Amino acid sequence: SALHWRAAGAATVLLVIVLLAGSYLAVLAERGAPGAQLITYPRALWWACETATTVGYXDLYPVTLWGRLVAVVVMVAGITSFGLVTAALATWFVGREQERR
């Protein structure tokens, strides 16, 4: 339909993808580093979620260079997405209420 509305949803599908590839890539990068805890897929997915939302509790975090780079991408994707939905809600509210005048 509307650009902003489409870009938002596209941002959401893209998010889910980054979340999954994030889980895969994180484990791939962290495994091999002594003491690393981001080493099994199920928890790595939960790590990805709390990173993308930025709640970073943490209970798990990358410690290798590539794990951190993967973390940086997930952070930005999550922030961009959640930020692309706010702009879509602002476009909807503005354009709309503009009629209520």
Partner: antibody, heavy 118, light 108 residues
Framework: QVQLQQPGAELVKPGASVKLSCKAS????????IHWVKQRPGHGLEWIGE????????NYNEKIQKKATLTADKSSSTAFMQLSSLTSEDSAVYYC???????????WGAGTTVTVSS | DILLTQSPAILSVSPGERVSFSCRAS??????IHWYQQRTNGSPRLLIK???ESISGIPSRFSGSGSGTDFTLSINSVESEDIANYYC?????????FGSGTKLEIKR
């Protein structure tokens, strides 16, 4: 159907080299890691290393000399471990096991008995 | 690198009794512990995963408990087929590691 198939035994002369194999069956996912565990007679289990076939990357135990090199062949679904410059010390039973990226070893191979003698 | 300690190394029990093996982690690992069985001339067999979760195809006799650094694998009423070597393994931190081992022995 036996999930992992390994040659029953291998003989190697000191200083020589042998390449063990492990053919897998059943379901196969991108999240599969194949591990190699070494067991000397009368003793316990010793993690040697791991490899992720879908990507081809492997990691090895730092607390021990690196006699092994891991490789994988996607087409024939076989994982190989190249043991080099052996000695009586490298003589034991080598297992391969599969892990679904969740931390435990679901299934093991029968194990390949390796002997280093002249 | 997490050090898993299993003591004692040999456990002797009377048929039908209740036996308990213990694993000691050198640092908190949650419940990221798993147990294996290896009979003579055999290969390891997963018995319990994640400290408590039961595996499919394993007698309801086998159970596990613990969290942090202290874990226990129990057998309610042990029997002959249980004579073997039990090992624990952690997946909390890299690299995965194995316990030294515990042998179960029956006194008939």
């Amino acid at each position: 159907q036996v999930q992992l198939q390994q040659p029953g035994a291998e003989l190697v002369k000191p200083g020589a080299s042998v390449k063990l194999s492990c053919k897998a069956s059943g379901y196969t996912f991108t999240s599969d890691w194949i591990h190699w565990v070494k067991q000397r007679p009368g003793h316990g289990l010793e993690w040697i290393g791991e490899i992720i076939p879908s990507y081809g990357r492997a990691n090895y135990n730092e607390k021990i000399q690196k006699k092994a090199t891991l490789t994988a062949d996607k087409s024939s679904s076989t994982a190989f471990m190249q043991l080099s410059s052996l000695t009586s010390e490298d003589s034991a039973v080598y297992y391969c096991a599969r892990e679904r990226g969740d931390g435990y070893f679901a299934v093991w191979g029968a194990g390949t008995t390796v002997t280093v003698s002249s | 690198d997490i050090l898993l300690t299993q003591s004692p190394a040999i456990l002797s029990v009377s048929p039908g009794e209740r036996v308990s093996f213990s694993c000691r982690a050198s640092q908190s690992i949650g419940t990221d512990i798993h147990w294996y069985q290896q009979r003579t001339n055999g290969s390891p067999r997963l018995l319990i995963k994640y400290a408590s979760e039961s595996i499919s195809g394993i007698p309801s006799r086998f159970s596990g408990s613990g969290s942090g650094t202290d874990f226990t694998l129990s057998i309610n009423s042990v029997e002959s087929e249980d004579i073997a070597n039990y090992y624990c393994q952690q997946s909390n931190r890299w690299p995965f590691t194995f316990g030294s081992g515990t042998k179960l022995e029956i006194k008939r």
